[PDB]
Amino acid sequence: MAKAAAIGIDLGTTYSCVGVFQHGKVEIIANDQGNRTTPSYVAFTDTERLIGDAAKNQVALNPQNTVFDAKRLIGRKFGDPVVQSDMKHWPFQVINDGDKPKVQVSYKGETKAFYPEEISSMVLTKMKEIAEAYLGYPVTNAVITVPAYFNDSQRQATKDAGVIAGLNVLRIINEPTAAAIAYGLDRTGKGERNVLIFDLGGGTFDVSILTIDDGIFEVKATAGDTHLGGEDFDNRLVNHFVEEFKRKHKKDISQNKRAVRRLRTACERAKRTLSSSTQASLEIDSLFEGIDFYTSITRARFEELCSDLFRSTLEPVEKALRDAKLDKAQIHDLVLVGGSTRIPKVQKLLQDFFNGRDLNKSINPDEAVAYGAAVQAAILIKSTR
Numbered sequence: 001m002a003k004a005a006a007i008g009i010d011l012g013t014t015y016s017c018v019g020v021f022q023h024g025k026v027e028i029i030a031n032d033q034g035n036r037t038t039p040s041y042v043a044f045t046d047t048e049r050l051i052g053d054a055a056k057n058q059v060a061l062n063p064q065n066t067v068f069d070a071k072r073l074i075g076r077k078f079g080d081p082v083v084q085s086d087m088k089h090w091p092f093q094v095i096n097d098g099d100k101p102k103v104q105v106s107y108k109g110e111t112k113a114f115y116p117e118e119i120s121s122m123v124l125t126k127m128k129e130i131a132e133a134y135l136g137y138p139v140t141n142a143v144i145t146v147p148a149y150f151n152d153s154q155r156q157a158t159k160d161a162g163v164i165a166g167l168n169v170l171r172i173i174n175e176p177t178a179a180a181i182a183y184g185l186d187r188t189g190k191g192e193r194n195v196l197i198f199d200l201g202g203g204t205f206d207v208s209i210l211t212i213d214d215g216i217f218e219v220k221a222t223a224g225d226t227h228l229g230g231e232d233f234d235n236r237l238v239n240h241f242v243e244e245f246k247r248k249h250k251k252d253i254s255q256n257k258r259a260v261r262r263l264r265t266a267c268e269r270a271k272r273t274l275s276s277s278t279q280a281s282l283e284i285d286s287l288f289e290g291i292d293f294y295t296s297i298t299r300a301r302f303e304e305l306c307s308d309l310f311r312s313t314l315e316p317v318e319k320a321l322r323d324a325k326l327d328k329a330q331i332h333d334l335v336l337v338g339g340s341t342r343i344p345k346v347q348k349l350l351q352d353f354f355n356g357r358d359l360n361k362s363i364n365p366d367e368a369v370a371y372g373a374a375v376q377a378a379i380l381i382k383s384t385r
């Protein structure tokens with residue numbers, strides 16, 4: 001029953017996803033709000049602890065006690081230059097506890113401090129409860145994914161987050177490996193298969209090259225930009241609309257925190273519409289000083305606004321190919337991962353770089369990693385019996 005059941009968890013930097021393989025198919029499990037992905041946010045309030053959508057929804061009201069980006073801290077030392085650099089951009093406090101970072105917050109009127117693995121365990125607990133509500137029984141066996149460049153310390157702290165959450169961690173697998181499993185790329189029989197995984201998420205960009213020789217996976221190269229993602233595209237739309245508001249009304253809105261956040265959430269929504277329509281409308285009632293902001297934007301203007309950012313995704317693709325010592329024609333498969341790969345211009349740039357090649361994109365790119373993890377968790381739990 002429960003002991004023969006296993007889930008697949010994509011524990012992402014900005015969003016997490018949970019899947020289950022049963023009756024010959026993967027089911028990506030929707031949360032209580034009906035969303036197939038859940039924000040990796042934990043809010044500490046005067047009365048409760050919020051996880052996911054509810055935590056993301058009150059981030060503007062409570063920025064000092066809303067934790068996110070815990071994956072950027074997990075398995076790292078406080079003195080690490082990555083930690084020191086990132087700390088300057090977060091609204092929550094990061095403290096040093098014997099060269100280990102802890103996030104310090106106000107919770108139910110008291111000062112509390114948590115290890116990154118304790119924060120990630122709260123996200124994992126929510127993913128586990130989303131699966132339990134769907135299945136009708138508690139599921140404890142799980143496959144948890146990590147980026148291919150995570151070292152032993154980061155992998156061990158992710159497994160510890162799984163233990164704190166009440167999960168029996170069957171295996172910690174690489175995100176690009178879970179994505180290649182989702183597309184059944186390890187079941188093509190004999191001969192080495194070269195796979196490129198193009199992963200463009202909310203806050204990070206990763207390119208991975210794998211060789212699959214008789215079911216065995218090998219990471220040949222990893223490249224990317226840890227500070228490039230969907231949120232940089234939203235911010236480009238934000239700057240455009242701030243300049244448009246200034247031209248129409250001769251008023252600068254940039255200093256009004258509420259106006260910028262309402263514009264930001266509307267921009268993110270409009271960006272998603274632009275992936276399936278050639279125009280999107282913004283409808284913001286009383287944006288600033290009682291002025292409604294009812295406008296539109298073409299996909300052509302959006303592509304111009306982000307042009308340099310889209311083009312920059314091809315430098316790590318080239319870097320990964322040189323590190324892997326492979327030419328373009330030596331890559332058998334191209335796999336898309338991350339919500340931002342739905343952007344038509346991104347797909348066109350990648351397809352043209354690979355000389356008009358077909359892309360593996362039929363599985364929802366923000367769900368492909370959880371999908372593969374769910375497949376692996378089913379195989380692993382069957383072998384355990």
Ligand SMILES: Nc1ncnc2c1nc(Cl)n2[C@@H]1O[C@H](CO)[C@@H](O)[C@H]1O
Nearest residue numbers: 201202230231272275338339340342
């Ligand atoms: N339809 C879409 N068109 C463009 N961007 C999208 C889309 N869906 C998601 Cl999710 N994202 C973005 O992906 C990230 C999460 O993986 C977020 O930045 C989200 O906006």
